[PDB]
């Protein structure tokens, strides 16, 4: 694996208006209760490709990806977390509203998925970023998993890698869990406006990417660990996740 640039390993947590990181244990409880409609997400794109998917099942896998942070979840039938489907066709695959009251909400846009998903498929497959083998169905599976795990990151108090210092509805982004000394995959919380996560992960792995490769990076996990205890964004225990390695020098 190549060396991921520091900017792609940088993780930003959601702080309030007083520079204090939101505590997601305090927000969701020790166990995060969440709801999903009757699953059955269906995608229809043309170039044609159809695909049906259990929202419940894909959310389940995504949450499990984040389990190393020490979080625990609980699917509950419809102040709790909501996963929903929308059809704005907004050139936006997914979106999340982080609510300190516990009612954080994540949406997956079918209209956007139907329109714009395949727009980088052939571009990537030629770059060697995804296998020439990969089917159009698997690619839509891949993008959906990435999208859900990425939005889960937002649910767990993370923002985008490049949003340190930027202002948000409930406060400001502050870097958490910094670790530049340990090589690792790019964060799944890369700003999608500025990065192609699949492309960057492929650059890191020096080979095409599969579903088993994607997921929260080491720093992503450490970031949520910080969000699970909150406190000052200025605390060194919050700001750094491997500074002890400095002693080895």
């Amino acid at each position: 694996a190549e060396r991921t640039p520091n900017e792609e390993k940088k993780v930003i947590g959601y702080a309030d208006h007083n520079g204090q990181l939101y505590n997601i244990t305090s927000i969701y409880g020790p166990v995060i209760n969440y709801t999903v409609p009757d699953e059955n997400i269906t995608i229809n794109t043309i170039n044609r490709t159809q695909l049906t998917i259990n929202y419940s099942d894909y959310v389940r896998e995504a949450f499990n990806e984040w389990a190393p942070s020490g979080i625990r979840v609980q699917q509950v039938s419809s102040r709790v977390v909501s996963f929903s489907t929308t059809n704005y066709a907004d050139n936006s695959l997914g979106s999340t509203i982080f609510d300190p009251s516990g009612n954080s909400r994540t949406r997956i846009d079918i209209g956007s998925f139907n329109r714009i998903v395949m727009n980088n498929f052939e571009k990537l497959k030629s770059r060697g970023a995804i296998p020439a083998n990969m089917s159009p169905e698997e690619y839509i599976k891949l993008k959906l998993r990435i999208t859900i795990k990425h939005e889960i990151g937002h649910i767990l108090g993370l923002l985008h890698n490049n949003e340190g210092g930027s202002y948000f509805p409930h406060g400001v982004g502050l870097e958490v869990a910094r670790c530049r000394l340990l090589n690792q995959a790019p964060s799944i919380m890369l700003n999608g406006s500025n990065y192609d996560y699949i492309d960057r992960l492929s650059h890191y792995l020096e080979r095409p990417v599969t579903e088993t490769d994607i997921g929260p990076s080491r720093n992503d996990i450490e970031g949520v660990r910080v969000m699970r205890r909150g406190g000052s964004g200025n605390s060194f225990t919050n700001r750094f996740s491997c500074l002890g390695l400095g002693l080895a020098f």
Binding site: F236, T237, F240, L243, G244, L247
Partner: protein, 105 residues
């Protein structure tokens, strides 16, 4: 006999006391000014300690340990780790650090 822990060690010296802190360093002060080549640390409750300027009270065998201790305290400050205990001489102001314990128990 050789001490097994900071309390045994601290009891081998006069004018010393064990401070149980379990707190991170709040302020770190480092001076290179002549005759004040020293480090001072304080905790959130106001407790203040120094590593003394090297002097005639120090054995030759203590010269490198003085520097090691200053290294350890700076690293503790930067990482924000909790200090478990300090053994300090009370006949200096600020109290002067003789030994440190870090514990994750």
């Amino acid at each position: 006999m050789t001490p097994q822990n900071i309390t045994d060690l601290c009891n081998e010296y006069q004018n010393t006391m064990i401070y149980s802190l379990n707190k991170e360093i709040a302020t770190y002060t480092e001076s290179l000014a002549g005759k004040r080549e020293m480090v001072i640390i304080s905790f959130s409750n106001g407790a203040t300690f120094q590593v003394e300027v090297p002097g005639s009270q120090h054995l030759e065998s203590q010269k490198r340990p003085l520097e090691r201790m200053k290294d350890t305290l700076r690293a503790a400050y930067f990482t924000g780790i909790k200090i478990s205990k300090l053994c300090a001489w009370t006949n200096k102001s600020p109290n002067s650090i003789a030994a440190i314990e870090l514990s994750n128990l």
